[PDB]
Amino acid sequence: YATLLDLDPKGKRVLVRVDYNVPVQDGKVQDETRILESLPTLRHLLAGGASLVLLSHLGRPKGPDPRYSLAPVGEALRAHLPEARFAPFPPGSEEARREAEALRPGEVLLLENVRFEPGEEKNDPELSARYARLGEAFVLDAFGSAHRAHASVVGVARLLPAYAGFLMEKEVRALSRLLKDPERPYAVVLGGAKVSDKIGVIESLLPRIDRLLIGGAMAFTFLKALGGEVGRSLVEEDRLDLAKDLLGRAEALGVRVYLPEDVVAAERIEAGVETRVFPARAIPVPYMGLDIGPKTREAFARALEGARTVFWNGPMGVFEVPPFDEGTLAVGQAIAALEGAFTVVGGGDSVAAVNRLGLKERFGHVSTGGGASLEFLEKGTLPGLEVLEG
Hints:
By secondary structure, the chain is α/β, with parallel strands linked by helices. The protein has two domains: 1-177, Phosphoglycerate kinase, N-terminal domain (Rossmann fold, 3-Layer(aba) Sandwich); 178-390, Rossmann fold (3-Layer(aba) Sandwich), CATH 3.40.50. The chain is built from 14 helices and 15 strands. Helix 7 packs across helix 13, helix 8 (218-225) packs across helix 9 and helix 10 (294-304) packs parallel to helix 11 (326-337). It starts with 12 loop residues before the first strand and ends with a helix. The relative contact order is 0.12. The PDB classes it as transferase.
């Protein structure tokens, strides 16, 4: 696992895979956070005497799509690094190769959305070789993209001396603590819509944890599995069986599991909609549970008391829909208030809650990997990390 301290950037053209998948609206970035998070890595390279070619994804565009151009990100980056420019050329094009070859030491070139290239998500060898012509060394600093063997993440890494950036290094060390005898009690807080997407990581963590708090829509599959009546709440009939087995092994492994006991419900998911609070195992048909209730927020905070290690990923309810973001905000303050503990928060809505509460500084580590982080904890590595050697 080579880091930036193993690379001498003097006189070299360095290709760097960054994570610039930021929100954009009307040709303007709405949140520069991801861009700011990459500067430590970029400035270190520039300081050492390098020129840089940057590659990033943006949204899930269906082939070339002006809607997802990185031009707005280029302007944002330019406010921070005076010599950074954006060129509307696809990463593997001849125009892009020539633009990078013209680069002078100190310049920073951001190329077009890598997802515009048809061979990107398929790790196409030809495409990878094309990216290799962009620089003499490769630096992967987009942890949120390291769980997939894509052309700009794994492919190009195999053709050029590859190293991990500061962001990558930080994410890996924070997550490693969670897999290396962390301080007890160790509590995990998981949230999300479907359970099927958390089974792998839940299984992996069970034998290492002491407490499991489950919120969000995924919790109703569990409640239903215990014989509850969840009304029109979202449930995966296809997982009711495994969900019940998971609660069993949990108990057998000596892990305390906490589930919602009350919920805030409505007949439709809409901002400002009228709500009613019901017991979590007695939601009247018409209604859908869309967030954890007041008693549940209370019990969850009580369950976290005394924990010395906490990992939280996922919303407690439909976060982006105004009334239903309260449970997630309550859990964030509960974890932020903890003392003497190593707390880690990841996933879009959970991180968003922390930011809105102005509680970032209160957390041990704010994950930038999202699902990547969950897979690392699940498998112990990622394909984007295995290629970071010489």
